[PDB]
Amino acid sequence: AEIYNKDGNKVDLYGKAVGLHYFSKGNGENSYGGNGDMTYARLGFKGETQINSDLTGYGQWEYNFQGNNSEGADAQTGNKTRLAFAGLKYADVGSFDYGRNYGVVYDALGYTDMLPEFGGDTAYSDDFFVGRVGGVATYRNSNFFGLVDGLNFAVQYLGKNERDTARRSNGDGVGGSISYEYEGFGIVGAYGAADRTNLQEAQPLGNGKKAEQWATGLKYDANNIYLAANYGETRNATPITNKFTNTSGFANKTQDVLLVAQYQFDFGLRPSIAYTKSKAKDVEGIGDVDLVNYFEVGATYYFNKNMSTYVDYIINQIDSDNKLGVGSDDTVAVGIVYQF
Amino acid sequence: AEIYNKDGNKVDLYGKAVGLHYFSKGNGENSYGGNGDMTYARLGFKGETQINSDLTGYGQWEYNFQGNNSEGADAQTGNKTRLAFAGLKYADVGSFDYGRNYGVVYDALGYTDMLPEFGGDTAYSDDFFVGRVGGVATYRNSNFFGLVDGLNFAVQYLGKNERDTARRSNGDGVGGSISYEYEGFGIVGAYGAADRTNLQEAQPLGNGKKAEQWATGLKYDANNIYLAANYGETRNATPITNKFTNTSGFANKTQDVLLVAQYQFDFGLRPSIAYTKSKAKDVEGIGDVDLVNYFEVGATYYFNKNMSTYVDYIINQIDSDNKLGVGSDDTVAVGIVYQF
Amino acid sequence: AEIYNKDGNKVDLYGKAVGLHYFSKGNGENSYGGNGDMTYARLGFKGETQINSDLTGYGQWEYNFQGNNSEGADAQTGNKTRLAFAGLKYADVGSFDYGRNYGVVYDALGYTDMLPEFGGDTAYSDDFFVGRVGGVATYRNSNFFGLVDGLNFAVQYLGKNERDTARRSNGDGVGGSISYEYEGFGIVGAYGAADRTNLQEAQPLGNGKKAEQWATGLKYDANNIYLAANYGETRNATPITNKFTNTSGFANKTQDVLLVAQYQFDFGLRPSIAYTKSKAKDVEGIGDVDLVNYFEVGATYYFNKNMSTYVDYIINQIDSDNKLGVGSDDTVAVGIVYQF
């Protein structure tokens, strides 16, 4: 909701309150999504100022407040800043911003990241180029300088981030994306590679000095119809855990397939059908193991642009024999979301 | 302060800056409320959208930022999300919301929760039904479906919350409240019971598999006069600590009495008189021990609807011989509050 | 940006998104400011209500969200409440507020606290009177009761804060400031003394029972010209660390000199020249050691009141022979800031 707009500068203060609950058998420790209260809220602001006819300055910040914690010691569990950056758009030259933003390879994965609750399984956070990462400089260009309609590209530099964890770290890397959209249709290609930190190489799982992520997307968006499919692979980038030996690291190689089919009825119902399978290859010792595998049936009902509720149901195609210990149970999510 | 209102959707962004200080002798470790800076701030939003003539969608989030911490390691001590839920009101059918919200039994305790600073002693957080808890589904009904004026009831389901602490945990339980208000007068009854988690039963203090909380309230509200009294009891629900043996758990049985008398002068002074006594029964070993006991004299002065200051003074009726080690000293609170 | 203004009460919701990066050689552990992503955001609110013709109530809260953390365990590193207080202004009597606010001695140091990124080195947080501290009652007076133009003073009481750290603690103390400004010119004097806590005296570095901080400032502000100089000293107040023996405490005595020269060009460039030197005296064992010493060359470019970027470059005058281990390398900062 735009709360301010004077002197060529408008500030949009958005957010939302999401009452959420997960339903799975047992404690939910062996299920796909877990079990129990998952309530949370959002807050943030999109700022945009017109420096002049061609020049636009902008900034954004988005935080995540968990609502399923107590007010005691664990009050903080789950809270974090999701986005935080600032930049400039210029005429038909393109735009540039820096801070914590999405990785270029998400330009592709975004296509199937549409499910009511789950989905977008291969878009991990702080995982190089496939999700939200810190310290990325992103240049983007629309309509190839205004010369070609529907043709966009983007180049991105990922600063070295040597954190405490192997999972949340990353060396220096570059990446890019070319996407063309023409009348309901869109095709996207994204790729990126980066140095792995010492702590990352020192891990038992995963072998190499270089991380790679590429994904291509194809979608038809129009007429209340949303059809999208994603295919991508990774080298020493997807984080995995062997729950049996308590080993941590990265999967030498992964192949990812996301499929989504949704329809928006006029009275406000939007049923969703999705399939996701992410298999890892050459997992030292295990060999080939499925990390994610399921069919998704769900629907979101929009009372309007502010209110809505949804049921998201994951039919877990992982079996109890999973070599890494990936949960094999189903998970149903029920949500009731207000937002401004 | 309502910062937005367009298209049947209004967003209220509220909050406040409370400069606060506690005065007690010694460290304040043996006093009622402690001693030293207690400054803090609030932020939150009430969102409400009219889906149509009968249907209203709403959401809310409320956070607590402590201001008495340094900017070092302890920056986070005390911060937490207080509220976070979303729901729907429908015609004369009633309303329903889910998330972190107040427990039904607070419908009663709310009556005496009026003091300038302290009071509301038996409305603990994350304590089943008597305070703010996570993962509660609440159905409420006004004027018995619009058929009877001033007659409201509410049923509430409390989801299982197995946290790290015994104090902040809780099993599954149901609860409700019937309140009738007729012309300055109000009578309320609330009750709820829930399963105790294993960690809770594994505690040294408290014995049982079931937790119970009920409280009834009676109030006269009108003519600048506020008179209210609450009486309630609990089974294995009120959290207690034996400061001597460092034992923790719950009081098998408690009896609670809250009394409040306030008057609102026209020039903006509102003197407050209150009495609170909460005694525990059958405390394994100790027997009968007072958890809370004091007389309260205080006054809030409202410069207007945005500004105000207050002095709250607790005359602690607990003696130095308390078997559990409950502080026995007095505490005076001085506050200066801005809010929007 | 003022988002609300009705009934004599206006609420200003401000904030900013700062994409930031530090450039220094090596792991940035031996440099002046460090090395790597330094992105962060701000949020806060200034509230002001007119109780009447002479009376104004106000409140403020300002938080700091770091953007260079991951969304994992370290999500919280760096976040904190910077400001949180409320108060009243009255006619020509003066103003009074309480909470977490700036220390009086900052009234002086503020003069040179102007650099694009760094600078203001001797204005530490939670360090008695020279920076933001918790539990301070501040009385301020403008134009000596409206009797003398440009003559302001302020008296401040600092409540005892016995935290976990020696660095973040402080006993009871008083302080004040007299500043006179007449047509482009300003002269300021500030002083304060406070009791040191036991934990503070129990430290290896620093000796005494009393902490003292005084600083005087002289500035010319007008005509796009900003010239300012600060000189101050301290007794057992400036926190120092011996990186060799891993000793912590306070410098018995320090002498501080800040010099800043800036010019605001009309097209939006503001070049900045600054010199800072803070030397400690009588450091048990070491003797005289420089804590801070550098020349600063930088410039901020303002696209307008909302957008801007800057390069801040510190030419570190500390040498590799520093007896305390103070970083000796240079640091360049590049920033792109949106704000509302």
Query: CB-based burial of residue B106 (10 Å sphere; 0-12 exposed, 13-18 middle, 19+ buried)?
Result: buried
Domain regions of chain B by residue span: 1-340
**Residue pointed to by tokens 């049982």:** B208
Distances (CA, A) of B143 to B94, B181, B217, B219: 9, 10, 19, 19
Out of A79, A85, A88, the one facing C17 most closely (by C-beta) is A85
Which residues are CB-contacts of B120 (< 8 A; sequence separation ≥ 6)?
A: B109, B112, B113, B114, B258
Q: From the DSSP assignment, how many helices (H) and strands (E) are in chain B?
A: 3, 20
CA distance B99 to A39: 6
**CB–CB of C281/C289 below 8 Å?**
no
Per DSSP, the three-state class of B186 is: strand
Per DSSP, the three-state class of B302 is: coil
**C77 secondary structure, DSSP code:** T
> How do the residues of chain C divide into helix, strand and coil, expressed in percent and rounded to 5?
5, 60, 35
Distances (CA, A) of C282 to A37, B198, C99, C232, C290: 58, 59, 34, 17, 11
Largest distance between two CA atoms of chain B: 62
Which residues are CB-contacts of A278 (< 8 A; sequence separation ≥ 6)?
A: A121, A122, A238, A254, A255, A256, A257, A290, A291, A292, A293
CA distance C211 to C192: 8
**C205 secondary structure, DSSP code:** B
- Cross-strand bridge partners of residue C279: C255, C290
Q: Give the best residue of B336, B337, B339 to mutate against chain C (max C CB count within 10 A).
A: B336
Left (φ > 0), alpha (ψ -120 to 50) or beta: where does B92 sit? alpha
| Amino acid identity for residue B215 in this structure | A
| Amino acid identity for residue B177 in this structure | S
Q: Tell me the technique behind this structure.
A: X-ray
Record the resolution, in angstroms.
3.8
Nearest chain C Cα distance for residue A338, angstroms: 22
With contacts defined as CB-CB under 8 Å, which chain A residues touch C1? 4, 6, 9, 11
Tell me the three-class secondary structure of B133-164, residue by residue.
EEEEEEEEECHHHHCCCCEEEEEEEECCECCC
| Amino acid identity for residue A13 in this structure | L
The DSSP line for A124-163 is -TTSTTSSEEEEEEEEEESHHHHTSTTEEEEEEEE--B--
Cα dihedral: B20, B24, B29, B33 (round 10) = -50
Pairing of strands B40-50, B55-66: antiparallel
Beta carbons of B134 and A43 less than 8 Å apart: no
CA distance A297 to A330: 12
CA distance A116 to C314: 50
Nearest chain C Cα distance for residue A65, angstroms: 12
- Per the structure block, which two tokens stand in for B17? 């800056």
**CB–CB of A80/A43 below 8 Å?**
no
Gyration radius of chain A over CA positions: 21
Beta carbons of A70 and B97 less than 8 Å apart: no
Query: CB-based burial of residue A212 (10 Å sphere; 0-12 exposed, 13-18 middle, 19+ buried)?
Result: buried
With contacts defined as CB-CB under 8 Å, which chain A residues touch B132? 71
Beta carbons of C9 and B306 less than 8 Å apart: yes
Residue C216: how many other CB atoms lie within 10 Å: 18
Q: Residue A260: name the closest of A303, A231, A289, A290 by CA.
A: A231
| Amino acid identity for residue B163 in this structure | R
> How do the residues of chain A divide into helix, strand and coil, expressed in percent and rounded to 5?
5, 60, 35
Q: Residue A249: name the closest of A219, A286, A275 by CA.
A: A286
Beta carbons of C59 and B337 less than 8 Å apart: yes
Counted across chains A and B, CB pairs separated by less than 8 A come out at: 156
Q: Where does chain C show beta strands of DSSP type E?
A: 2-6, 9-23, 36-37, 40-50, 55-66, 80-90, 94-102, 132-141, 151-158, 173-182, 185-195, 210-222, 225-235, 239-242, 247-250, 253-263, 269-283, 287-301, 307-316, 331-339
Return phi, psi of residue A307, to 5°.
-115, 160
Q: Which residues of A touch C (CB under 8 A)?
A: 3-4, 6-7, 9, 11, 13, 45, 47, 49, 51, 55, 57-61, 63, 76, 79-82, 84-88, 97-100, 125-126, 132, 134-135, 159-161, 163-165, 167-168
> How do the residues of chain B divide into helix, strand and coil, expressed in percent and rounded to 5?
5, 60, 35
Nearest chain C Cα distance for residue A17, angstroms: 19
CA distance C330 to A31: 52
| Amino acid identity for residue A139 in this structure | Y
Per DSSP, the three-state class of C163 is: coil
CA distance B37 to C98: 10
Gyration radius of chain B over CA positions: 21
Pairing of strands B173-182, B239-242: unpaired
Beta carbons of C86 and B17 less than 8 Å apart: yes
Nearest chain A Cα distance for residue B126, angstroms: 6
**CB–CB of B90/B54 below 8 Å?**
yes
Beta carbons of C71 and A86 less than 8 Å apart: no
Per DSSP, the three-state class of B271 is: strand
Residue C321 belongs to what H/E stretch? none
- Cross-strand bridge partners of residue A230: A217, A258
CA distance B20 to B334: 6
Q: From the DSSP assignment, how many helices (H) and strands (E) are in chain C?
A: 3, 20
Query: CB-based burial of residue C319 (10 Å sphere; 0-12 exposed, 13-18 middle, 19+ buried)?
Result: exposed
First to last CA, chain A: 5
Return phi, psi of residue C75, to 5°.
-55, -30
Which residues are CB-contacts of B287 (< 8 A; sequence separation ≥ 6)?
A: B281, B323
Beta carbons of C17 and A167 less than 8 Å apart: no
CA distance B163 to B127: 12
**CB–CB of C190/C159 below 8 Å?**
no
| Amino acid identity for residue B31 in this structure | S
Nearest chain A Cα distance for residue C264, angstroms: 18
- Per the structure block, which two tokens stand in for B277? 């006594």
**A224 secondary structure, DSSP code:** T
- Per the structure block, which two tokens stand in for B262? 């306030």
CA distance C87 to C137: 10
| Amino acid identity for residue B226 in this structure | Y
**Residue pointed to by tokens 């007690």:** B24
CA distance A324 to A306: 41
Residue A288: how many other CB atoms lie within 10 Å: 12
Cβ-count burial B187-196 (b if 16+ within 10 Å, e if not): bbbbbbbbbb
| Amino acid identity for residue B282 in this structure | D
| Amino acid identity for residue C53 in this structure | S
Beta carbons of C72 and A132 less than 8 Å apart: no
What's CA B219's distance to the chain center, in Å? 17
Beta carbons of A81 and C73 less than 8 Å apart: no
Nearest chain A Cα distance for residue B169, angstroms: 9
- Cross-strand bridge partners of residue C194: C173, C211
**Residue pointed to by tokens 């002197």:** A7
Query: CA B192, B194, B200, B201 torsion: positive or negative?
Result: positive
What's CA B323's distance to the chain center, in Å? 26
Distances (CA, A) of C168 to B57, C124, C162, C199, C200: 46, 10, 8, 10, 9
Query: CB-based burial of residue A198 (10 Å sphere; 0-12 exposed, 13-18 middle, 19+ buried)?
Result: exposed
CA distance A58 to C336: 10
CATH homologous superfamily, domain B1-340: Porin (2.40.160.10)
CA distance B1 to A261: 42
Q: Which residues of A touch B (CB under 8 A)?
A: 1-3, 13, 15-21, 36-37, 39-41, 43, 65-76, 303-307, 336-340
CA distance B119 to B294: 10
**CB–CB of A289/A283 below 8 Å?**
yes
CA distance B281 to C263: 74
